[PDB]
């Protein structure tokens, strides 16, 4: 009946941004006002839809993409952005319709001695297409000499860890992000407001 927003927003662990999660939400009633009052969100904006009108709308499905990035990178989760995250990890289209929601998760995702579980992709041959996911771990050839499985200068394992520790500056602290895509198909709606 009620949409399982808790499974996404309150998951004990989030995905690394390079392997960002997508949860298909269907056949349920969604109260986005309650969701807005669910926590102390630092980001809760929408594109192509009005936030305060979400409870009046019906969608065919809703897709919740979720991941962790550092604070300074939240700005990249938006149309028309560039940077390591937008280029190589998670890319929204220029005509994105949906909502971006982000909150500081330093209390959940940082640990003394470092939490290294959250990773990001630092190198890639080309930029991701919108909503593309790349989970490959092939050695990146940044130079003219082929790597052939050997790591070294200009031959990089393409993922790096955030290594969140609890006293990082806020720009280097972990932020959990949920991007809600509201799918409109020429089919009966399955996700409506109250």
């Amino acid at each position, epitope marked *: 009946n009620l949409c399982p927003f808790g499974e996404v927003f309150n998951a004990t662990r989030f995905a690394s941004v390079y392997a960002w999660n997508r949860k298909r939400i269907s056949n349920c009633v969604a109260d986005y006002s309650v969701l807005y009052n669910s926590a102390s969100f630092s980001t809760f904006k929408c594109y192509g839809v009005s936030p305060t009108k979400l409870n009046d709308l019906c969608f065919t499905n809703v897709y919740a993409d979720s991941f962790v990035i550092r604070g300074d990178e939240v700005r990249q989760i938006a149309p028309g952005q560039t940077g390591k995250i937008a280029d190589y990890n998670y890319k929204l289209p220029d005509d994105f319709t949906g909502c971006v929601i982000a909150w500081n998760s330093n209390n959940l995702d940082s640990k*003394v001695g470092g939490n290294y579980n959250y990773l990001y992709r630092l190198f890639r041959k080309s930029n991701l297409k919108p909503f593309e996911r790349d989970i490959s771990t092939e050695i990146y050839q940044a130079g003219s000499t082929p790597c052939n499985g050997v790591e070294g200068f200009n031959c990089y394992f393409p993922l*790096q860890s955030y290594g969140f520790q609890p006293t990082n500056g806020v720009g280097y602290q972990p932020y959990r992000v949920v991007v809600l895509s509201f799918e409109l198909l020429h089919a009966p709606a399955t996700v409506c407001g109250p």
Partner: nanobody
Amino acid sequence: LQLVESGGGLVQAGGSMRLSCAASISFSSFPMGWHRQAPGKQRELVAKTGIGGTAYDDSVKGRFTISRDNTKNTVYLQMNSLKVEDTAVYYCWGWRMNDYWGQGTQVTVSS
């Protein structure tokens, strides 16, 4: 294996020794450190270091010192004031998506 240990052996209580470890893969932004397993006991952390910080087991604080050369992807464990309890198999360790372990090096401290 990706982690190659060196050092170890037999020492008297109060003595010292130094363990070394070289990785053939890059642990840049990832942790490297040392674990140990006494006979009939569970393998436990000794020390680790990385961009996330440096942590020691309570029993070795003030006696063991971990260091790391990021350029060579090497990690070291200076073991001072060795105690009989410090006798164990010591493993070089890293984490990069999965755990990486060295071969295991016997350290024996007797009086």
